[PDB]
Scaffold this active site. Structure first.
Site, mmCIF file in Angstrom:
data_model
loop_
_atom_site.group_PDB
_atom_site.id
_atom_site.type_symbol
_atom_site.label_atom_id
_atom_site.label_comp_id
_atom_site.label_asym_id
_atom_site.label_seq_id
_atom_site.Cartn_x
_atom_site.Cartn_y
_atom_site.Cartn_z
ATOM 1 N N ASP A 60 1.011 -1.314 -0.018
ATOM 2 C CA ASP A 60 -0.040 0.105 0.154
ATOM 3 C C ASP A 60 0.771 1.227 -0.160
ATOM 4 O O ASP A 60 1.998 1.112 0.792
ATOM 5 C CB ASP A 60 -0.957 0.030 1.313
ATOM 6 C CG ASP A 60 -1.878 1.198 1.338
ATOM 7 O OD1 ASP A 60 -1.679 2.371 0.903
ATOM 8 O OD2 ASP A 60 -3.064 1.194 1.814
ATOM 9 N N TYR A 61 0.414 2.226 -0.913
ATOM 10 C CA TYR A 61 1.150 3.500 -0.723
ATOM 11 C C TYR A 61 0.755 4.194 0.385
ATOM 12 O O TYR A 61 -0.459 4.519 0.576
ATOM 13 C CB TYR A 61 0.963 4.169 -2.055
ATOM 14 C CG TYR A 61 2.194 3.880 -3.137
ATOM 15 C CD1 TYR A 61 3.295 4.428 -3.003
ATOM 16 C CD2 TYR A 61 1.518 3.372 -4.341
ATOM 17 C CE1 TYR A 61 4.174 3.900 -4.126
ATOM 18 C CE2 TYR A 61 2.352 3.107 -5.538
ATOM 19 C CZ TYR A 61 3.626 3.475 -5.291
ATOM 20 O OH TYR A 61 4.548 3.040 -6.289
ATOM 21 N N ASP B 154 -4.828 1.862 -4.785
ATOM 22 C CA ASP B 154 -3.579 2.263 -4.146
ATOM 23 C C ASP B 154 -2.689 1.211 -3.737
ATOM 24 O O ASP B 154 -1.570 1.406 -3.204
ATOM 25 C CB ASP B 154 -3.731 3.165 -2.991
ATOM 26 C CG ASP B 154 -2.918 3.862 -2.498
ATOM 27 O OD1 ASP B 154 -1.918 4.906 -3.106
ATOM 28 O OD2 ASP B 154 -2.630 4.065 -1.109
HETATM 29 N N1 DDS Z 1 -12.358 11.539 0.986
HETATM 30 C C1 DDS Z 1 -11.379 11.490 -0.107
HETATM 31 N N2 DDS Z 1 -11.487 12.599 -1.212
HETATM 32 C C2 DDS Z 1 -10.483 12.473 -2.078
HETATM 33 N N3 DDS Z 1 -9.561 11.383 -2.103
HETATM 34 C C3 DDS Z 1 -9.688 10.444 -1.203
HETATM 35 C C4 DDS Z 1 -10.566 10.389 -0.306
HETATM 36 N N4 DDS Z 1 -10.263 9.498 0.502
HETATM 37 C C5 DDS Z 1 -9.261 8.849 0.128
HETATM 38 N N5 DDS Z 1 -8.657 9.189 -1.019
HETATM 39 C C6 DDS Z 1 -7.810 8.916 -1.921
HETATM 40 C C7 DDS Z 1 -6.336 9.622 -1.435
HETATM 41 C C8 DDS Z 1 -5.251 8.247 -1.391
HETATM 42 C C9 DDS Z 1 -6.051 7.331 -2.188
HETATM 43 C C10 DDS Z 1 -5.986 6.071 -1.037
HETATM 44 O O1 DDS Z 1 -6.759 5.993 -0.512
HETATM 45 P P1 DDS Z 1 -6.525 5.965 1.231
HETATM 46 O O2 DDS Z 1 -7.919 5.882 2.276
HETATM 47 O O3 DDS Z 1 -5.841 4.545 1.511
HETATM 48 O O4 DDS Z 1 -5.514 7.009 1.824
HETATM 49 P P2 DDS Z 1 -4.253 6.763 2.152
HETATM 50 O O5 DDS Z 1 -3.374 8.223 2.021
HETATM 51 O O6 DDS Z 1 -3.344 5.879 1.509
HETATM 52 O O7 DDS Z 1 -4.289 6.501 4.047
HETATM 53 P P3 DDS Z 1 -3.342 5.416 4.878
HETATM 54 O O8 DDS Z 1 -3.401 4.574 4.019
HETATM 55 O O9 DDS Z 1 -1.930 6.306 5.198
HETATM 56 O O10 DDS Z 1 -4.317 5.274 6.139
HETATM 57 O O11 DDS Z 1 -7.612 7.546 -2.045
HETATM 58 MG MG MG Z 2 -2.932 3.975 1.079
#
Ligand code: DDS
Ligand code: MG
Length: 598
Positions: free
Chosen positions: A360-361, A548
DNA sequence: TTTTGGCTTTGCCA
C-alpha cells in the site's frame, strides 16, 4: 481493394507467409470465433487474420494443424513486432484459454488510444471509430457481420484491416499530444497486466463466507425481534417510506432518512442505531455475499473456488475499476454486538500453501500534491515518518498525536482531502462539527499554513482556463470545457475536477507504472513460472488492485523474496521531491493481513 | 445545486 489470402492452404505458401511475417515491425491481428461458450482452437477459435496494410489481410485457418499452430506461436510470442488488436484484454484471454498462446511483445489497442485522446468521452465501438477517424474505409464496414449472420473468416479479415487503418491515424493523433511514448510504455503494459489479473482471479473460500452469512442472518433475526419490540407491530424495514411514516414523525425530528441525519440522532433513543445497523448489514448481505456466491468458478488445478473480475479501465482520472460484483467495494472489518468481527475480506484466501501480500502507498496523493505544489511545509512533514492524518487530528482535537483513534484519523483524512479538493466552509462546518465561520477560519489557516497548496490550486485553475485541459504527471490530458462557463456552480465544479484530476491521474499513473515494473521484475526473477493460473507456483500472481494497493498471492518460500521486490519497485517507480513510502502486509487472507516490517 | 473517482441514489470502497 480488400483482399483475403488463405496462407494455410499450401506448405510453401505458409512457410513464406511466416518468413515475411516475422520481419514486419508492425502488424494487426484479429481472431475468428464461432458461437460457443466457456475455448477450443479447433472448435471455438477458427483461425487468425493478420494485416500489414494496403487492405490486404492474410487469414490463417486452424481447422482441418500442429505445424501451423507452432509457427503461429513462434510468430506471436516474441517474433519491432508490434501487434495491434482491438480489445487487447479480450484477445489475450481468448488466445490463452483457446490455444495457450500468450501475446509476448509490444501490444497496442485503438480503444486505449481513443481513451487517451479524450478520457471523458464515451467508449466507441470499432465501426464508430471508422466513421470518425478513418472514413475512407467506410465501404469495408459491410462485412463485419450483422445482428444475425457473420462469416468468421471475412469478419476477422475486415476487423484486422480496419484496426490497422485506425491505429495509423490514432498513432498520429497521439504524437501531436506527446502521449505516444506514454501509450506504448505505461498504458499498454498495464492492459496486459490487467489481462493477467483477470486470468488469475482471486481465491474465495465458501466455508468462511457461509459462516459470515449465517452470522448476518442471525443478526437480522435479532434486530427484527428487537425493533418489533420497540414498536409492537410487524412492519417492513427495507422500505424507506415505512420508516418515514409513524417512526421519527412524532417521536423525533430532523424525510431524507439517510445515514447522516440519523447519526446525529444516535445519541438519543437507540431506534436509529438499530436501523443503521440493520441497513448496513442488509446492504452487505445484498451486495457482497450473494453476488460473490454465484460468480465463483471451481479451478480444478488449484482445487479451489476463485472469483474472476472484469477490468473496466476506461475512467476519467485513470483509476481502474471492475464490473458489477466489484471486489474493491467489499466493506472492511466491523463489529456486531451479537462481540463478533465481521471480516468479509477474510473469505478471500490464497491457494493451498500461500499468503496474501498487499503493498500500500502511504499517502500517495498527498505526496503527489507535495511534489507538484513544491510546498515546503507539507513536503518536510512527509519525510520524517510522522503521520499527517494523525498530527492533523491531534492539533484539531487537542489530544496527543500518539493517542489518536483510528476513527479520528479517518476523519482527519477526510477533512484534509476535502479541503485540498475545494470543500466549502459549510460542508466543513457540518462535517467537523463547528459553525460555518469557524470552518472558514480553519480553511484559511490551512491555506496560510501550506502556502504551496493554495498557489498550486490557483495555478492549476489558471492553466486549465488557459489551455482548456488539465495534464497529469505523465502527460495524460483531461479536457474540461466547463472551466470558462458563465455559471458559477459549473465553473467551480470544473475547478474542483481540474485539481482532483491533476492529483488523482498522477497517482494512478504511478500505480500503473509500479504494477508494470513489478510484473517485469517478477518475470525476470522467476522465468520458469506460469504467467497466470489459466496457463499451466513460483512467484506472485497479482490477484487484485485497490487503486492504491497491489494484492499478490505468493508461496511460503517466496513471501520475503516477493515482498522485497514489490516494495523496491513501488518505492522506485518514480523520482519525486518526496519519498514514496509503501508498506507491505502479508497474511493468511485478505482480511487477516499483518504488517511485515522489513 | 458547492471535496472527487468508481459502482449503485446513497453508501461502500478508493
Ligand atoms: N475523501 C477523499 N477525498 C479524496 N480523495 C480521497 C479521499 N479518501 C481517499 N482518497 C484517496 C487519496 C489516497 C487514495 C488512497 O486511499 P486511502 O484511504 O487508503 O488513503 P491513504 O492516504 O493511503 O491513507 P493511509 O493508507 O495512510 O491510512 O484515495
Ligand atoms: Mg493507502
Amino acid at each position: 481493394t480488400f483482399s483475403i489470402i488463405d496462407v494455410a492452404s499450401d506448405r510453401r505458401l505458409f512457410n513464406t507467409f511466416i518468413k515475411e511475417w516475422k520481419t514486419k515491425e508492425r502488424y494487426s491481428l484479429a481472431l475468428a470465433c464461432e458461437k460457443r461458450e466457456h475455448d477450443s482452437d479447433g472448435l471455438v477459435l477458427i483461425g487468425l487474420s493478420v494485416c500489414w496494410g494496403a487492405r490486404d489481410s492474410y487469414y490463417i485457418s486452424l481447422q482441418q494443424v500442429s505445424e501451423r499452430l507452432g509457427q503461429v506461436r513462434s510468430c506471436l510470442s516474441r517474433p519491432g513486432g508490434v501487434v495491434v488488436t482491438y480489445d487487447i484484454i479480450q484477445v489475450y484471454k481468448t488466445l490463452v484459454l483457446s490455444c495457450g498462446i500468450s501475446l509476448a511483445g509490444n501490444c497496442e489497442d485503438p480503444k486505449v488510444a481513443c481513451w487517451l485522446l479524450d478520457p471523458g468521452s464515451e467508449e466507441r465501438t470499432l465501426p464508430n471509430m471508422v466513421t470518425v477517424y478513418c472514413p475512407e474505409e467506410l465501404p469495408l464496414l459491410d462485412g463485419l457481420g450483422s445482428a444475425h449472420a457473420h462469416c468468421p473468416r471475412v469478419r476477422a479479415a475486415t476487423k484486422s484491416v480496419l484496426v490497422h487503418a485506425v491505429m495509423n491515424h490514432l498513432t498520429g493523433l497521439l504524437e501531436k499530444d506527446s502521449m505516444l511514448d506514454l501509450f506504448r510504455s505505461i498504458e499498454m503494459p498495464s492492459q496486459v497486466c490487467l489481462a493477467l489479473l483477470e486470468l488469475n482471479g482471486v481465491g474465495f473460500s465458501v466455508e468462511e463466507c457461509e459462516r459470515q452469512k449465517h452470522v448476518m442472518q442471525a443478526k437480522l433475526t435479532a434486530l427484527e425481534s428487537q425493533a418489533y419490540n420497540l414498536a409492537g407491530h410487524s412492519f417492513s424495514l427495507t422500505s424507506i417510506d415505512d420508516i418515514a411514516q409513524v417512526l421519527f414523525l412524532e417521536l423525533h425530528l430532523p424525510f431524507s432518512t439517510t445515514k447522516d441525519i440519523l447519526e446525529k440522532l444516535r445519541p438519543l433513543h437507540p431506534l436509529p442505531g438499530v436501523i443503521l445497523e440493520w441497513r448496513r448489514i442488509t446492504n452487505a448481505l445484498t451486495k457482497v455475499v450473494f453476488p460473490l456466491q454465484r460468480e465463483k468458478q471451481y479451478h480444478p488445478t488449484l482445487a479451489m473456488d476463485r472469483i474472476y473480475p472484469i477490468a473496466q479501465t476506461h475512467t476519467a482520472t485513470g483509476r481502474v475499476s471492475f464490473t458489477e460484483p466489484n471486489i474493491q467495494n467489499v466493506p472492511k472489518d466491523f463489529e456486531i454486538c451479537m462481540a463478533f468481527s465481521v471480516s468479509m475480506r477474510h473469505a478471500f484466501v490464497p491457494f493451498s500453501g500461500g499468503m496474501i501480500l498487499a503493498a500500500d502507498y502511504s499517502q500517495l496523493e498527498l505526496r503527489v500534491l507535495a511534489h507538484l505544489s513544491k510546498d515546503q511545509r507539507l513536503l518536510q512533514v512527509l519525510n520524517g515518518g510522522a503521520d499527517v492524518f494523525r498530527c492533523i487530528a491531534a492539533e484539531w482535537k487537542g489530544v496527543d498525536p500518539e493517542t489518536v483513534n483510528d476513527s479520528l484519523r479517518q476523519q482527519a483524512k477526510q477533512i484534509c482531502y476535502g479541503i485540498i479538493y475545494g470543500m466549502g466552509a459549510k460542508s466543513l462546518g457540518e462535517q467537523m462539527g463547528v459553525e460555518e465561520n469557524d470552518a472558514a477560519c480553519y480553511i484559511e489557516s490551512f491555506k496560510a499554513r501550506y502556502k504551496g497548496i493554495n498557489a498550486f490550486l490557483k495555478e492549476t485553475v489558471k492553466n486549465c482556463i488557459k489551455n482548456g485541459y488539465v495534464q497529469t504527471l505523465m502527460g495524460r490530458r483531461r479536457y474540461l470545457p466547463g472551466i470558462s462557463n458563465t455559471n458559477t456552480h459549473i465553473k467551480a465544479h470544473a475547478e474542483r475536477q481540474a485539481v482532483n484530476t491533476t492529483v488523482q491521474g498522477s497517482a494512478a499513473d504511478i500505480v500503473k507504472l509500479a504494477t508494470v515494473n513489478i510484473q517485469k521484475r517478477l518475470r525476470k526473477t522467476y522465468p520458469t513460472a506460469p504467467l497466470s493460473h489459466q496457463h499451466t507456483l513460483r512467484g506472485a500472481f497479482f490477484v487484485l488492485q485497490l487503486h492504491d494497493e497491489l494484492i499478490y498471492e505468493t508461496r511460503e518460500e517466496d513471501l520475503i523474496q516477493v515482498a522485497q521486490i514489490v516494495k523496491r519497485e513501488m518505492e522506485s517507480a518514480v523520482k519525486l521531491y518526496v519519498k514514496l513510502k509503501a508498506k507491505v502486509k502479508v497474511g493468511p487472507s485478505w482480511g487477516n493481513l499483518q504488517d511485515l516490517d522489513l
